A paper describes a structure:
The riboflavin biosynthetic pathway is well-studied with dedicated enzymes to perform complex chemical transformations, with the exception of an unknown phosphatase that catalyzes the dephosphorylation of ARAPDP, the product of RibD, to generate 5-amino-6-ribitylamino-pyrimidinedione (ARAPD), the substrate for lumazine synthase. Using an anaerobic activity-based screen, two phosphatases from Aquifex aeolicus were identified that dephosphorylate ARAPDP, but only one reconstitutes riboflavin production in a one-pot experiment with the other four enzymes of riboflavin biosynthesis. The structures of both enzymes were determined by X-ray crystallography to reveal the vastly different folds capable of performing the ARAPDP dephosphorylation chemistry.
Numbering used by the authors:
A (entry chain A): 3 to 262
B (entry chain B): 3 to 263
Write the structure that this text describes.
């Protein structure tokens, strides 16, 4: 029952990804709009989102689509798509090629289908409930490691955050002291996929929106990973994820400094 | 006479890079030695270093070569090569493909030639004093931006550090508040090249060794960047680098928390 949703997710992610490909390296300061204090958006994000939404609604006209840049369209369906048309906008504008398109479907409150496309590397991560997780048609799974000194952890948190920065610096410092490496690549959907692929053992990302994480959560769960979502799923949330050992370790650190 | 040194630097970087390409994804826990409190090394790092050194000394048998993993070879020379046979070891072992081979030459105390090879992406950054900086034979230059909110800054510092972690957290937080983005990719030589290429406006990396930075400093300077080295150049140093605007900003932040001389 999920296969058609999954193939459409992938096509929609590719459709937005093509916009990203055609414009990579072309976005000048003249084209950047400010959102809030530190966020940027351009015609690239918005055009990608238009294309993704169009694809999804042509196949599933009664579905709801929720995108970062232009909001929601639909009439109240239990099938809700959460779309980040450009995850890694700052990286994209700078020419740092860690950026993605994220297309995730939830049924009620359960994430069931995900596709995350990295256009610069032509790498498509995908997965659906009960069907497994894949990158370009190779099956993927989280790494088995439980040794903290061998673990790698990806992290992110915003500047000008809702929480005091000290909370994130304290969680960071305690995890940093124990693990082999910590990396901050700047695209949360890609971080989830790299845990799912078995590159990083754990991840902690703060102040996420549902389009940041929905597709990656499907892929992570199908890869055997586990996660904890702190806060409101349809609002601003925090994600702690990994294999079982690193999820548990990061969560126990975070609990000293914030309620989870 | 820099052209012959430069072409050899590139060949040596490729020679080590080929060892990295052949073994990427193959290093198991069995193969990993622990160096200090948190550092790893494997047969891959050491084989890459052997190949790089062999190339350099076949062409320049009287030069000095200094590698991270097996130290120095030579008999005293004005010409000293500083080699990181695998910059980004932890990334490499994990399968995160941001890693490089760094091959830099100093004449006395002046860096004069650099090559940094990213084997996964087959991207060779190279430069020499007065000859420019290049990536795969396209000329490169640092970005012009002076707007902090548009700037991107790459950073790194170690998890068992000589300085108290609070110093690095304080410098980080003050730069983070003002700039558009901060990124931690995990390979200092690659960070220097990404500033040289015009991707990131600035960089701050703490507790570096000379093989981490020599090649990248040549490339950065030929790209029009500027840098400040804090500490002993032939010892453990810190680097603050960027275009002029971001170098100055990051340096002014760091001065609040550490002596930058
Ligand atoms: Mg976005
Ligand atoms: Mg996002
Ligand atoms: Mg090294
Ligand atoms: Mg190094």
């Amino acid at each position: 029952n999920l296969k058609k949703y999954l193939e459409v997710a992938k096509i929609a992610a590719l459709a937005g990804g093509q916009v990203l490909k055609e414009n990579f390296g072309k976005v000048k300061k003249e084209n950047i709009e400010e959102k809030g204090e530190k966020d940027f958006v351009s015609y690239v994000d918005k055009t990608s989102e238009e294309r993704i939404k169009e694809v999804i609604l042509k196949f599933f006209p009664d579905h709801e689509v929720v995108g970062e840049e232009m909001g929601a369209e639909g009439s109240g369906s239990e099938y809700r798509w959460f779309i980040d048309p450009l995850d890694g906008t700052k990286n994209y504008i700078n020419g740092f090629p860690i950026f993605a398109v994220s297309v995730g479907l939830v049924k009620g409150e359960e994430p069931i289908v995900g596709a995350v496309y990295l256009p610069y590397f032509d790498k498509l991560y995908w997965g659906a409930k009960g069907l497994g997780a894949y990158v370009n048609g190779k099956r993927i799974k989280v790494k088995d490691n439980e040794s903290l000194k061998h673990a790698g952890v990806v992290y992110g948190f915003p500047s000008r955050s809702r929480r005091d920065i000290s909370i994130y610096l304290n969680i960071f410092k305690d995890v940093f002291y124990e693990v082999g490496s910590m990396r901050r690549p700047g695209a949360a959907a890609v971080d989830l996929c790299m845990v799912a692929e078995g590159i990083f053992d754990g991840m902690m990302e703060f102040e996420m929106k549902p389009w940041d994480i929905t597709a990656g959560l499907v892929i992570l769960k199908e890869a055997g990973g586990v996660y904890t979502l702190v806060g409101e799923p349809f609002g601003v949330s925090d994600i702690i994820a990994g294999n079982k050992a690193l999820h548990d370790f990061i969560l126990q650190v975070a609990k000293k400094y914030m309620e989870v």
